Structure formats: structure tokens, C-alpha cells
Amino acid sequence: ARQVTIIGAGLAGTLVARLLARNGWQVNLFERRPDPRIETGARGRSINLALAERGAHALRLAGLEREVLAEAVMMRGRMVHVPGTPPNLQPYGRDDSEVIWSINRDRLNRILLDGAEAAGASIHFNLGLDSVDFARQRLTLSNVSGERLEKRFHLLIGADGCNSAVRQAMASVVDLGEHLETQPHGYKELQITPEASAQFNLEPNALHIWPHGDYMCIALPNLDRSFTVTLFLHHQSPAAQPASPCFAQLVDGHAARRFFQRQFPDLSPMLDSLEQDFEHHPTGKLATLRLTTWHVGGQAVLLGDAAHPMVPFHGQGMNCALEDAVALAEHLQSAADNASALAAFTAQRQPDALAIQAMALENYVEMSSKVASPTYLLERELGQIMAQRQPTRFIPRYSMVTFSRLPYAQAMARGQIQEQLLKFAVANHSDLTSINLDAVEHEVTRCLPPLSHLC
Ligand SMILES: Cc1cc2nc3c(=O)[nH]c(=O)nc-3n(C[C@H](O)[C@H](O)[C@H](O)COP(=O)(O)OP(=O)(O)OC[C@H]3O[C@@H](n4cnc5c(N)ncnc54)[C@H](O)[C@@H]3O)c2cc1C
Ligand SMILES: Nc1ccccc1C(=O)C[C@H](N)C(=O)O
């Protein structure tokens, strides 16, 4: 049987472990953290994530989608909150098939671990990779105390996240050609209890947003009607707007409460544990990292966040990472040798990772605006008529990304054509009735070939 060692029993690494093990491979998976299925007296984990069609499809191929969705809350649309003003759903799509799902991250990881073991993978926890000797084909791991132990490997998969040690180790033998692009927002996890959720009548089946321009909060629902909230806020005030809010001014929980009472006056009273959460949850950093090189011959490959860290504003990191896992397993299963598989996987996935990294960055401005332009509104209206006239040609970029499996680069390219056609058609008009609709439709059929078999 073909042998593989995967570093990182997170979301992509556990999926790819199940796909390879079930297809005959002898799989060993090493994870730095303890096994989250071993119950302890520690506090419960509250991070959740949006699962969309790309990740759900990956799970479906793995036979795990039904299990994960039984523990997921449907989000039918965005619920945008701006003070005093009543929220109204902006639905994601036309019916409940076009929804995204809110799932507890720890639960998803526990379901994936059970899936990898059921397929025959061996998982070893409390061992973090420290280094790799590619010439000798040996790995060095240690527990939290740092005491080193070595393991031989044959094929190494780095599914070890944004600060991947496999990627770091690859720098010793290849030029990674890395481009690290910092992003100025940090983030902080907060919580709305089930009682406050109900008191303030927050719709459970929606993604909630409190836009505020250069900062914003989002909230995703849990099965118990609590919401996990994330504040995105600059670490530091930029040189030009030097008094503007940032994490550096929020020196403690009390300061954070004042900031929320001033800037998010409607959300603040929903957040009972703000002061505590602010002080005990560390502030997270965001970044986009692009790498020229994702593999070393047939010996080692990166996927998921180890290959392509991205900013979180599209909710697609996990979805892309599970899509990567499926592609990697497909290439490894059927290729002439591991070197061929890994080069082909990389060539396939790199243009798509670049496109979703860019679209993620672009998604911030959308989400964080308190008010949409009249121009933007009219473009959206016209787009809705086009989608109705030509649903296999005009499919909004958001939907191509979230509700289909169209390669991300293609979704980006078609989104660009759509953006230009709407922009030119709406210019110098203030309403639909002044727009030549057939002429727009003619540009749609001229410029956008039909796609079948999308949903
Ligand atoms: C604030 C925020 C919100 C997000 N929201 C969404 C969302 O709504 N939807 C979505 O699709 N994505 C979202 N993401 C992105 C998602 O969290 C990641 O893209 C996804 O977890 C990547 O999966 P992965 O398997 O590559 O990495 P991970 O799931 O991070 O797993 C790597 C695993 O590596 C283990 N490990 C790390 N280093 C070592 C080592 N040296 N040795 C052994 N093990 C190691 C880590 O402990 C771990 O278990 C969000 C990200 C952030 C930061
Ligand atoms: N779901 C998320 C979870 C966390 C961070 C962002 C998102 C998103 O906003 C993606 C979704 N389609 C959205 O754009 O509304």
C-alpha cells in the first residue's frame, strides 16, 4: 500500500486523510493539539464557520455531509444592522437551496476526525512538526515541552495551517517565492447568549452584520440560538487618520465597552460578556500569503491555509481548503507517480487560489458599508432582471463563488464581464425604465457563454 504522512488534523488534513485511506493508502496524521474528542473539563469551544457549496460538496464526496449538516444552522441571507433602523433580510438566493450553513468548528473537526479513523487513518496527537530533513526522509516532531522525536516519511502533506511548519521546512530546499501581504484589521471573538439573542429578536437563520466603514462586526448563529460575534478592527490607527478607532486604544475590557457603547450602540447591550471576552480572547491577525512553489518534487505538498492563507471576508477559506483536499486525493490516486500528481495538483489549484484570495479582499468593502450607493442599487436591480432572463449566462459573482463549483478563476473572469456590462448600462440613468433592457440582454448573450450543470 502507498504511504503518506499528513501534518495537521484540521479541516483539509482530516478530509484528505479519509479520502486517501479509504482508497488504499496507509495514512499517518500528526496533530500538535490534543484530540478534541477526548472530553475534558475545559470550557466549550465557540468558533463557527460558514459552509457553502464547495465545502459541502467535498463533504458529500466523503460521505460526511449529512452528518455535518445535522449540526448546522441555515443562513438564508444577510441581516444588516444600522442603528435605530429596522433590519430586513437580504436573501442570498431564490430559495432555501441557496443558503450557507453555520457550523461549530470543533464539531466539524470532530466529525472529520471520526471519518478519517473510520477509513483506516492513524492519527497521532500532541505532536507538532518542528523540522523536515528531506534528504534523509525524516521528520522531527515534539510535544508542547519540545522533546524531539523523529519519524520516517515517504510522502508528506502539509495541512498545517497559516503558519505551516511544512512550508517553513520546504524553504530549506526550494525557493517558496512567498509574497506576504499584511492586512490592517485584527479580529476579536465575542458572544451573544441564547437569552439575549431571543430578547433582541435576532433572526436565527441569517448571517448578521453591523457595518461601520473601516470596522464592522459579524455574527453567525449556533444551534442553541447563541451567536458567535467577530469584531474586525484595525490593530493601529493609520498615519493619515491617526485618531481613528483601533485595537491599540482598547487597552482593557472597560475601554472596549465604551467603544461599543459609542460606535455600536445597538449591539453593545446584546454582548453581556464583552469585557471578559475582550480580555481573555486574544486578538487575531489576518493576512494574504501567496507562494510560487507548493511542492518539493514528489516528496511534499501544501494545501489549504498552508498553501494559500487568505483574508476571511468571503467565508471561503475552509471551503477552498476542502476543495483542495478533494483535488489532491484525486491527483494522488490516479497519477503515474507522486511527483506527477503534485505538479498537476499545483498547476490546477494555483490559479483558483489566487482568484479567491483576491475576491476575499474585495469582499470587505461590500460588507462594511452602512449605505449602498444609488448606483450600486440600480446595478443590482438590473443584474436581477438579467439573471431572470438569462439564468445560465448571468449569474452574480457572489452566487458563482458561494453556490457553485465553477473554478474560482472563471467565476472572477465572468464577474468582471458582468460588472462592466451593468456599469455601462446604468451610467447616466436613475432608474430601470430608462435603461434599454434588450440591449443589455444582447450584451449578455454576446459576452457570456451559457453554463449548464451548475446547481
Ligand atoms: C476569523 C476567521 C473567520 C473565518 N470564517 C470562515 C468561514 O466562515 N468559512 C470558511 O470557509 N472559512 C473561514 N475561515 C477560514 C478557515 O478557518 C480556514 O481557511 C481553514 O480552517 C483552513 O483549513 P486547514 O485545514 O488548511 O487549516 P486548519 O483547519 O487551520 O488546520 C491545520 C491544523 O494544523 C495543526 N498544526 C498547525 N501547526 C502544526 C504543526 N507544526 N504540527 C502539527 N500540527 C500542526 C493546527 O493545530 C490544526 O489542527 C475563517 C478564518 C478566520 C481566521
Ligand atoms: N459567511 C461568513 C463567515 C465569516 C466571515 C465572512 C462570511 C461571509 O460574509 C461570506 C458570505 N457569503 C457572505 O459574504 O455573506
Curated annotation (Swiss-Prot):
Cystine pairs: none
Catalytic activity: L-kynurenine + NADPH + O2 + H(+) = 3-hydroxy-L-kynurenine + NADP(+) + H2O
InterPro entries: FAD-bd (IPR002938), FAD/NAD-bd_sf (IPR036188), Kynurenine_monooxygenase (IPR027545)
Enzyme Commission identifier(s): 1.14.13.9
Impact upon substituting residue 367 to L: Decreases kynurenine 3-monooxygenase activity
BP GO terms, sorted: anthranilate metabolic process; kynurenine metabolic process; L-tryptophan catabolic process; NAD biosynthetic process; NAD metabolic process; quinolinate biosynthetic process
Keyword flag Oxidoreductase: yes
Superkingdom, natural source: Bacteria
Annotated effect of mutating residue 92 to A/F: Abolishes kynurenine 3-monooxygenase activity
Pathway in which the depicted protein is active: Cofactor biosynthesis; NAD(+) biosynthesis; quinolinate from L-kynurenine: step 1/3; Siderophore biosynthesis; quinolobactin biosynthesis
Activity-pH behavior: Optimum pH is 8.5.
EC class: oxidoreductase
Residues involved in L-kynurenine binding: 78, 92, 363, 398
Protein family membership: Belongs to the aromatic-ring hydroxylase family. KMO subfamily.
Physiological role: Catalyzes the hydroxylation of L-kynurenine (L-Kyn) to form 3-hydroxy-L-kynurenine (L-3OHKyn). Probably required for the synthesis of quinolinic acid and the siderophore quinolobactin.
Name listed for the protein in its UniProt record: Kynurenine 3-monooxygenase
